[PDB]
């Protein structure tokens, strides 16, 4: 029961997804061939959350891999843990999106989404109790931004009551990987604010600082970054898969983390994160884990929480700990930083403690934050969008696929509303 | 799964094609024929046959038969399909009219047939790579004739073209301004993105960094061959951040009529002087934005950048690229246009650049090719238009063009279109 | 008891028939020489259904192979399991039909049918209890369409009370193997609607999709297609040959599958059907077998059931299963797709469960469907026929053998009546 | 069990017969005689004797004795039955009247006797394969005389004929229009299906795809020999979807007087250029419907198709054929007539085509022969009729024909019949 169906999209999503299943399979003891060789029996009790069983002990991920080009999937199946996936779930086209939201959404993915849903429904109908859908993509491209948002709309229209959570890689402020990021991002956000319950925003620039400052990693590959993203993805779905003192279902987080419908954008974090040479200088106890979780330099999003206030916060601990330490430390953070927390919410921390930690770590903790400071990200995108849109920078590529300038204005207006809404609820009562 | 149809028109394109297909064969392990001795990589450019013969997915066309005949007698004689090598009876005599109206009308129906036979054999069509000269003859007339045919039969499919733009001072023909404008008029609405290179600029690079005082056309073609390999590397090889041919269109073309990016290749370094260089990512990336290393003799700082595509190769860490681009963004000398805060497209590929045996480039670990769309190129078009006005004021050579199917009205229409293009460049260069 | 006499006709019938006996002999343990070398004794208990015994353990198929040309039979006896047949049953002429129904029916087979019946009667009179006749042919040719329908009329006139079932290969909509298909098909259908109890319609185009989509077969020979047809032919006659929890005689299907006399055209299916590389990703259980049996992409006929409603449906399962799963799954299909089932029939599924599955498969299931959507096939043929008949396209070849234009009008009128009848019973009560 | 009686009339048919029986002997392992060194395949064309001598089931007839005498002296001298080779005293002098009225009356009773002796020796009669020239002489007069005799003695038995149709421009005789129409008038009601080939068209194919600039008549005959082998392959060899000779009649003949299908053979490819070709089913199938590959110089797109028979060979997957034909059906350029939604007859045979030693065709894995009945041929008949009208208006050569048994009335009757045939083609080309 409480099954999760994973849905890939684009190059970024597939790359992260491949790493995600490498991590998930590791903690569940699944070999790359699909066989189970774990030690503990607790990792096999709730294996149905992510995997479907087959004859001979083969466990198949409940994952759908989709992209408009064959290359990224071909890389996925060739790489480690690539044969674990079911071949029928590789729903791909031939002519890719050129990093334009219009093509992936209206022109290219429109003729392929119907096939994708034929695999999503088949996976969904095989669940004893469907909990939600898990989507990994990027907002800065065409396929993930365009095609991913198209699937979100289709599923939310077909499964209204199931929780939809997205792990989106957000464009960075410092430098870009694509000239048309503002167009892709603004249009994609127009669909997320309406058809998802919790989106975990992450930017590559922030992860570079984590590798540079904390991990002291001098040659950070994209595989290294995907490991950090995979860690937080696994953390938010541990209470479904392992026992714990105080459990926290995905919906249990949404209620505690989403006061108003549209303020559901989170910036994640993880701990412990230390370099190889500095590991022998750490106590590795609850007091210090909570000390760095709330640090602005350990969050995988660019926005600094110091520039705004936290509406809500979640700390999903893993490993055997003293619940007194967790409750006291969370309260201690609340008291010291009372200026950083919205006052009309008396308690701003949701605590979850899972008994089984990740492999190789005695203790672990994932940080989730719904902060009013995230409006900085959206407002920065709006400034970039209006500058390009003010003189029709690239619309002929988007309008050539069927879009209209009216849609761009609607997307911009909705983004401004969201930024304003975040500012409204940043002020005290009366 | 991916594919590219390469059409090499004229002497420049055909001769550049030999450098390109000598390099693709090297990178994929082919043996100068279709034979690979005892894989999804080579499929992009080479079609396969049961015998083990890999056939290039290219068409060599030239109204003149001298250059293509040399291919039929050279080392790569057994490589190309005999019908792919299409030769005419007489050349265009450096005349746009002959290539487009008189002679091209007897060869276009044949080359387009082989394009039809190649397109339907592909699992999925991705675009076209057209190599031709801007100077004139077959590269100006026939290319425009073929480009318009493709825009009808294949429509929205990508159509990229590589052109040897006329040099500011160096010139090998007397009527280049006539031909250059005429092809430009008939290719703006049929071309998605045209990459420019100049003979004079590469001569300077081959003598300023490569320590060679005697560049031939063979040396230049090999430098051009590397650029195309960097562009098409994503399809051929795996990488960290892949870029497709259809991505170049929306990334580098803000407006439909401004689609002429420049070209750059940073680590153009001799073998001897490579022993005293670190060749780290920051220095090669910084080298791209220097005027001394551009492949087209147009100074970037005379105008504002509006789109840049950095295509890295080899051992490149994305963290270094992120920092390297950011520091460039900080510099006030490198001025982008106001309406493009999002100015960089980054592509990282794991396959390093392969050095052609007998070449000049060093065994570089990592290389970057920059495709920059800059307003400075408007000055070059202005210079080209100025030459046309002088000759046309006297009707210097019009009787040749008018006598082979063309009309006087085309000269007025062609130049008026370029005047609009120069005006369009002025509008994009100003904000508010 | 309950013997079945198999009757071949034409190239298509003989080709399928040869594969049919290769499959039947396999599950009964009969060597190509006629000897029995099976393990289980249950496969020898009811061997009399298809075989006659001879001295030394030789078992002879109760099959009659007939065609107007010697070539196809000569290929049959030369191929594997070709010597198993009795030589006397090869009733063939010399001058073949040129793919015209008139020659095989009126001119060429008229002088050969008398000899064929001399073997059919001899086979029939040797049965302890004759159940019916099994005919394999094609509607698109002359011999199968012409001569086959002539035998149907002769036998039905000579054995009125015995069940006549035909397995006919129907012309495809996408592309043709013969220019005169509409003439041959329409005339052949005029005889089937009156002189057979259940015809299983199959088209080569549909089988190509099954090989392409499901089996992922890249070099599908005609032998591969005949295997699919043979599988469904065997499935509909398993309760006669093996024990099971809930048996279903051929007549037991006809009563449950034929509400009105002329609506007896079925589109078959089979399961499981998976590729070699996707077999390790399947649970192979009752819930999923029934999931693909009703899929429109797994039926060996072109007509999509979604365009009409099912009058009746039969699911003959094979292998040891939980009868609860079968009953629940059949009901589940009934409830979900209630729009696809005729309402004035309260129950639209007939279930049969045989204990012994086909060799190499733990479970198997054959799908039979009497759908009002099959009128699309007949109406498409009618459009092709009228276009040719509107200006005497090829009648001189048919009228030259003795046919008359009046007969063509009668055949067309009867076809239109059948199409109309299918439409009448597609609407709800009152 | 199956059989075919081959009558080769005139120089063209006799010379074509040598190519045909040189190929049948090859495909069946025969050794240029009746001897097979230490099977139901060869029985279709060859009769067997206790000595091990396989005797061709063919009749070679010619009023002239030069060409048949060459056979009696050539390598296949010991193959044919001596009485099968029937030679006259004097030729027809390119005159229809001589072949039909004067000389043919002294040889028809002899050739028909050997047909009688062959027909009664067959286990089952299937049809006739008649090879003759349309130009004139024995191929126009004697063929009509023999065809009418067969239609009486053998009636409903199939009678197929292969004819070398006159070329549009090339012509080797001055009175072909007279002879061509005269034989057409007397063979419409006695022939079931006539397959047409033109010397000019095969010359183009032999020089456009086969890289041979010096075609002789030997080269053309070998190309024709392959076509007949493809037609008769089903009887000789096993296959996936067999087609009989009696099937061609109802499949390609919609109306009794329109029974002139064209002919095509797709993989006519040189050995050298075959190394750069995939030669898959879709491309060979698509090649059939191209004007550049038709064996008769009549452009298919000038009219509408009404019947096509695709006879595949070798390693051919029926799934590929199904898809290949379907995509052709989609194309709007390939326009079939409205009243024939069911337009394709498919035949697949396992035996690949055998290359005659010393030939030009490559060792192709799979080949397809297309027999297309198209309304475009009506234009060719119109051209032929036009030539007749000019000469007959002046009575250019009538005195020769009238002086050897014929009458003036036949010219009017013969041409009036052709006018009806051209009108009949117009009726079939229109709907509603
Ligand atoms: N880079 C490079 N450029 C070349 C080469 N060969 C010719 N060109 C350029 O081509 C320009 C003139 O066009 P051509 O290619 O020579 O003429 P064409 O395309 O053959 O057309 P025709 O005049 O009909 O022969 C010259 O200005 C040269 O700069 C070459 O091998 N390498
Ligand atoms: N395809 C092909 N056509 C031939 C060949 N030989 C002759 N012809 C054609 O035959 C036509 C003339 O008829 P012929 O066969 O030469 O004359 P004939 O049938 O021997 O009758 P006579 O005039 O009495 O000799 C010419 O126009 C040629 O096109 C051949 O070997 N191959
Ligand atoms: N971690 C990681 N991020 C990637 C990878 N590839 C692309 N991205 C991110 O994805 C964004 C570019 O969008 P992209 O997915 O390539 O466009 P799409 O193919 O149309 O979905 C940029 O923000 C990149 O940082 C990868 O392999 N790993
Ligand atoms: N599966 C299969 N179908 C065949 C075979 N031979 C012919 N057919 C089908 O039969 C039809 C042709 O009619 P055919 O039986 O050959 O004419 P007939 O000999 O007069 O009965 C076409 O639709 C073919 O697809 C075969 O060996 N296997
Ligand atoms: Mg030249
Ligand atoms: Mg002669």
UniProtKB/TrEMBL annotation, chains B, D:
Residues 42-239 form the Tubulin/FtsZ GTPase domain. InterPro entries: Alpha_tubulin, Tub_FtsZ_C, Tubulin, Tubulin/FtsZ-like_C, Tubulin/FtsZ_2-layer-sand-dom, Tubulin/FtsZ_GTPase_sf, Tubulin_C, Tubulin_CS. GTP binds at residues 11-12, 15, 92, 94, 133, 138-139, 172, 199, 217, 221. GO terms for biological process: microtubule cytoskeleton organization; mitotic cell cycle. The keyword Cell inner membrane does not apply. It holds the Pfam family Tubulin_C. Mg(2+) 1 binds at residues 62, 64. It catalyses: GTP + H2O = GDP + phosphate + H(+). Residues 241-386 form the Tubulin/FtsZ 2-layer sandwich domain. Tubulin is the major constituent of microtubules, a cylinder consisting of laterally associated linear protofilaments composed of alpha- and beta-tubulin heterodimers. Microtubules grow by the addition of GTP-tubulin dimers to the microtubule end, where a stabilizing cap forms. Below the cap, tubulin dimers are in GDP-bound state, owing to GTPase activity of alpha-tubulin. Belongs to the tubulin family. This is Tubulin alpha chain.
